[PDB]
Amino acid sequence: SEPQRLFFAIDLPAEIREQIIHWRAKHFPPEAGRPVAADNLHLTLAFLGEVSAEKEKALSLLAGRIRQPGFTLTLDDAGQWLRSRVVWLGMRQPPRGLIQLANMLRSQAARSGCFQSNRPFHPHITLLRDASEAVTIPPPGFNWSYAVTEFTLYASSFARGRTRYTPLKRWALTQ
Ligand SMILES: Nc1ncnc2c1ncn2[C@@H]1O[C@H](COP(=O)(O)OP(=O)(O)OP(=O)(O)O)[C@@H](O)[C@H]1O
Ligand SMILES: [Cl-]
Ligand SMILES: [Cl-]
Ligand SMILES: [Cl-]
Numbered sequence: 001s002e003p004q005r006l007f008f009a010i011d012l013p014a015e016i017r018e019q020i021i022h023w024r025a026k027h028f029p030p031e032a033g034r035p036v037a038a039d040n041l042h043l044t045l046a047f048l049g050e051v052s053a054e055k056e057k058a059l060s061l062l063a064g065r066i067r068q069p070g071f072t073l074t075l076d077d078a079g080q081w082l083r084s085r086v087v088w089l090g091m092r093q094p095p096r097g098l099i100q101l102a103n104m105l106r107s108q109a110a111r112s113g114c115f116q117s118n119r120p121f122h123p124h125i126t127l128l129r130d131a132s133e134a135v136t137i138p139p140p141g142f143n144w145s146y147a148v149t150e151f152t153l154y155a156s157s158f159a160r161g162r163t164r165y166t167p168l169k170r171w172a173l174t175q
């Protein structure tokens with residue numbers, strides 16, 4: 001019925017999310033940029049844009065065909081992209097499983113008509129937006145490492161000046 005704005009993502013366990021926001025607060029004054037709400041911290045795998053109900057169902061079926069092992073993420077990197085004005089967390093050497101999962105979902109989208117940026121996948125978790133000015137970036141905190149067991153399809157909506165993500169479907173990572 002409803003045409004929705006969709007994306008696939010990896011989520012953060014609550015403890016790591018709490019560590020990230022504490023570290024962010026400690027190292028980045030309000031002036032440095034607009035903080036992403038704690039609940040909204042995530043790692044995007046594929047952005048689908050505006051998707052019809054019929055297209056969403058077809059993409060969800062394809063997502064449900066994916067078979068691959070889970071993997072461990074360890075966030076050992078942080079940086080700023082002036083181009084899109086964000087400060088982010090990431091990995092120096094992302095696990096093969098993450099790259100493969102992202103490529104798979106993007107490939108499924110593209111083959112389904114959903115335009116995908118030719119820009120090489122750069123997995124990241126945005127912490128600050130509208131960070132239009134260069135700022136000092138400390139290394140991430142110690143031991144921000146966890147097992148990824150699932151990925152999730154989200155819908156994105158905006159009202160009241162706050163963006164909300166609503167989970168639609170989840171899939172476990174299984175061989
Ligand atoms: N054109 C795009 N290409 C790749 N990823 C995108 C694109 N647009 C959005 N995303 C990513 O998909 C996720 C959802 O984005 P969306 O634009 O719906 O909400 P948002 O960026 O959090 O909120 P807002 O755009 O209102 O500030 C975000 O992680 C975003 O960075
Ligand atoms: Cl937010
Ligand atoms: Cl950087
Ligand atoms: Cl981003």
Ligand SMILES: [Cl-]
Binds near residue numbers: 137138
């Ligand atoms: Cl720096």
Ligand SMILES: [Mg+2]
């Ligand atoms: Mg956006």
